Write an enzyme that holds these catalytic residues in place. Structure first.
Site, PDB file in Angstrom:
ATOM      1  N   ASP A  17      37.803  44.657  36.859  1.00 53.45           N
ATOM      2  CA  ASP A  17      37.877  43.561  37.606  1.00 53.45           C
ATOM      3  C   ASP A  17      38.450  43.636  39.302  1.00 53.45           C
ATOM      4  O   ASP A  17      39.305  44.029  39.519  1.00 53.45           O
ATOM      5  CB  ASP A  17      39.173  42.780  37.071  1.00 53.45           C
ATOM      6  CG  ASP A  17      39.355  41.445  37.653  1.00 53.45           C
ATOM      7  OD1 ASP A  17      38.558  40.825  38.300  1.00 53.45           O
ATOM      8  OD2 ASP A  17      40.729  40.825  37.586  1.00 53.45           O
ATOM      9  N   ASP A  28      34.540  39.249  43.066  1.00 55.81           N
ATOM     10  CA  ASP A  28      35.203  39.358  42.186  1.00 55.81           C
ATOM     11  C   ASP A  28      34.393  39.608  40.661  1.00 55.81           C
ATOM     12  O   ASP A  28      33.941  38.663  39.905  1.00 55.81           O
ATOM     13  CB  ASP A  28      36.041  38.060  41.741  1.00 55.81           C
ATOM     14  CG  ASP A  28      36.821  37.852  40.789  1.00 55.81           C
ATOM     15  OD1 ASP A  28      36.991  38.807  39.958  1.00 55.81           O
ATOM     16  OD2 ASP A  28      37.651  36.889  40.553  1.00 55.81           O
TER      17      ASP A  28
HETATM   18  C1  LIG Z   1      36.550  32.955  30.942  1.00 56.44           C
HETATM   19  O1  LIG Z   1      36.851  34.260  31.331  1.00 56.44           O
HETATM   20  C2  LIG Z   1      35.697  35.327  31.156  1.00 56.44           C
HETATM   21  C3  LIG Z   1      36.197  36.653  31.873  1.00 56.44           C
HETATM   22  O2  LIG Z   1      37.384  37.112  31.457  1.00 56.44           O
HETATM   23  C4  LIG Z   1      38.680  37.060  31.846  1.00 56.44           C
HETATM   24  C5  LIG Z   1      38.656  37.678  33.071  1.00 56.44           C
HETATM   25  C6  LIG Z   1      39.967  37.713  33.952  1.00 56.44           C
HETATM   26  C7  LIG Z   1      39.848  38.301  35.404  1.00 56.44           C
HETATM   27  C8  LIG Z   1      39.968  36.896  36.327  1.00 56.44           C
HETATM   28  C9  LIG Z   1      38.951  35.858  36.127  1.00 56.44           C
HETATM   29  S1  LIG Z   1      39.476  34.486  37.124  1.00 56.44           S
HETATM   30  O3  LIG Z   1      40.756  33.983  36.750  1.00 56.44           O
HETATM   31  C10 LIG Z   1      39.357  35.118  38.950  1.00 56.44           C
HETATM   32  C11 LIG Z   1      40.501  36.336  39.017  1.00 56.44           C
HETATM   33  N1  LIG Z   1      40.593  36.764  40.312  1.00 56.44           N
HETATM   34  C12 LIG Z   1      40.997  35.841  41.376  1.00 56.44           C
HETATM   35  C13 LIG Z   1      42.391  35.492  41.144  1.00 56.44           C
HETATM   36  C14 LIG Z   1      42.704  34.072  40.945  1.00 56.44           C
HETATM   37  C15 LIG Z   1      44.106  33.869  40.555  1.00 56.44           C
HETATM   38  C16 LIG Z   1      45.042  34.730  40.499  1.00 56.44           C
HETATM   39  C17 LIG Z   1      44.882  36.155  40.735  1.00 56.44           C
HETATM   40  C18 LIG Z   1      45.967  37.246  40.739  1.00 56.44           C
HETATM   41  C19 LIG Z   1      45.729  38.157  39.547  1.00 56.44           C
HETATM   42  C20 LIG Z   1      45.733  38.018  42.019  1.00 56.44           C
HETATM   43  C21 LIG Z   1      47.504  36.754  40.713  1.00 56.44           C
HETATM   44  C22 LIG Z   1      43.390  36.506  40.893  1.00 56.44           C
HETATM   45  C23 LIG Z   1      39.981  37.344  38.050  1.00 56.44           C
HETATM   46  O4  LIG Z   1      41.160  38.501  38.293  1.00 56.44           O
HETATM   47  C24 LIG Z   1      41.058  37.091  33.278  1.00 56.44           C
HETATM   48  C25 LIG Z   1      41.017  36.677  32.050  1.00 56.44           C
HETATM   49  F1  LIG Z   1      42.307  36.079  31.362  1.00 56.44           F
HETATM   50  C26 LIG Z   1      39.777  36.633  31.382  1.00 56.44           C
HETATM   51  N2  LIG Z   1      39.649  36.190  30.102  1.00 56.44           N
HETATM   52  C27 LIG Z   1      35.148  37.732  31.806  1.00 56.44           C
HETATM   53  F2  LIG Z   1      34.943  38.006  30.575  1.00 56.44           F
HETATM   54  F3  LIG Z   1      35.580  38.865  32.420  1.00 56.44           F
HETATM   55  F4  LIG Z   1      33.939  37.280  32.341  1.00 56.44           F
END
Ligand SMILES: COC[C@@H](Oc1cc(C[C@@H]2C[S@@](=O)C[C@H](NCc3cccc(C(C)(C)C)c3)[C@H]2O)cc(F)c1N)C(F)(F)F
Length: 376
Positions: free
Chosen positions: A35, A219
């Site tokens: 990630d 991302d």
């Molecule tokens: C549907 O999912 C499929 C997805 O699974 C996940 C993936 C994540 C990682 C997230 C996915 S989304 O939430 C964007 C985020 N990156 C930007 C961001 C947005 C808000 C807060 C943050 C901080 C961590 C810096 C606080 C960071 C990233 O890291 C968390 C989860 F739980 C799940 N399941 C898959 F399987 F990878 F495609």
């Protein structure tokens, strides 16, 4: 020695890409989501309906409790747990072991995915966005500090799926053509600046600040291309116009309803290519990456017993800026050159196929006043 890292990623469509890692002594094996959108290394450390295995701190002699709690709220999904350190290795990565921070996940909500086959997450971004705060050193920083691994990595995400994470370098056998670099604007997310957008060669003609409102990031943890409201609406409008020859339920354009065609009859030609122009390395210079519909129409298993080809629209609306997620990265080789504060793009060896079109990374282009595209 990068050949040992080629094809070290696996995944399922819409469920991320993961690499194998071991934590603790003796080594406990886990699959870990890669990630670039976060900065915490965290693993399931307690039973969960969707976990087939998890980190058992009691069984590791090298585990150290940091006696601090932690939680991370993602866009969708969050977990909380306890901080600690332990020894960590990547079997199909560089031949080293590092002591890294690890968040042991004890409770979670919509974080783990049923059937995803990963049990943890490796946030590869910068300490600025680490929780609880930027004093918790991210895994890659620990790796670079404790070993001779160079301060960069590259990702080849391929369209169930596989890919490569090359730690510490660039493997030239994984891409064709030239690498084009865009500056990392600020070291927190991997933030970049988009300076122009075109759909089938037609400029969207927006204030370029709209493209980066309130930021644009690369991302790998996000599936879709996500676009700020105004940009999303303009893009969908243009994509609808281009494909109006067919009919779709509007739940499809919201990324909810999938659409199917008879196997092999998907009308790829009626969907436009999307070109994102990124700020380049020299004055008034940019380059573009061109995305095919084979990337933003994500293949999904048919809800029916039928052997049709079904797809979901993998472009969606954002309220937190542009997110270049996995469907943008797929078919490109993306170099996260932390050492030189830049991100490189090249056509991937596993590039996406089309009969009369092709994903591309092209330059140089001239673009005036690129600095004005950044949002403040
Ligand atoms: C549907 O999912 C499929 C997805 O699974 C996940 C993936 C994540 C990682 C997230 C996915 S989304 O939430 C964007 C985020 N990156 C930007 C961001 C947005 C808000 C807060 C943050 C901080 C961590 C810096 C606080 C960071 C990233 O890291 C968390 C989860 F739980 C799940 N399941 C898959 F399987 F990878 F495609």
């Amino acid at each position: 020695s990068f050949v040992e890292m080629v094809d070290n990623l696996r995944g399922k469509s819409g469920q991320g890409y993961y690499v194998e890692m071991t934590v603790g002594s003796p080594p406990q094996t886990l699959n870990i989501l890669v990630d670039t959108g976060s900065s915490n290394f965290a693993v399931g450390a307690a039973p969960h309906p969707f976990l087939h295995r998890y980190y058992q701190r009691q069984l590791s002699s090298t585990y150290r409790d940091l006696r601090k709690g932690v939680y991370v709220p993602y866009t969708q999904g969050k977990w909380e747990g306890e901080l600690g350190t332990d020894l960590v290795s990547i079997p199909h990565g560089p031949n080293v072991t590092v002591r890294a921070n690890i968040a042991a996940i004890t409770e979670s909500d919509k974080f783990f995915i049923n059937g995803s086959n990963w049990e943890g997450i490796l946030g590869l971004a910068y300490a600025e966005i680490a929780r609880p705060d930027d004093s918790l050193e991210p895994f890659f920083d620990s790796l670079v500090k404790q070993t001779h691994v160079p301060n960069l990595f590259s990702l080849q995400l391929c369209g169930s799926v596989g890919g490569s994470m090359i730690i510490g370098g660039i493997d030239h056998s994984l891409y064709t053509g030239s690498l084009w670099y865009t500056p990392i604007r600020r070291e927190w997310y991997y933030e970049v600046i988009i300076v122009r957008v075109e759909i089938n060669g037609q400029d969207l003609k927006m204030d370029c600040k709209e493209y980066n409102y309130d930021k644009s990031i690369v991302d790998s943890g996000t599936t879709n291309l996500r676009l700020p409201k105004k940009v999303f609406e303009a893009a969908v409008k243009s994509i609808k116009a281009a494909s109006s020859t067919e009919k779709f339920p509007d739940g499809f354009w919201l990324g909810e309803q999938l659409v199917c065609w008879q196997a092999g009859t998907t009308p790829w030609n009626i969907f436009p290519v999307i070109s994102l122009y990124l700020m380049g390395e020299v004055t008034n210079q940019s380059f573009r990456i061109t995305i095919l519909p084979q990337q933003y129409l994500r293949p999904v298993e048919d809800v029916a017993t039928s052997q049709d080809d079904c797809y979901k629209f993998a472009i969606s609306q954002s309220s937190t800026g542009t997110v270049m997620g996995a469907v943008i990265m797929e078919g490109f080789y993306v170099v996260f050159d932390r050492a030189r504060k830049r991100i490189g793009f090249a056509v991937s060896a596993c590039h996406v196929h089309d009969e009369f079109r092709t994903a591309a990374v092209e330059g140089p282009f001239v673009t005036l006043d690129m600095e004005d595209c950044g949002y403040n």
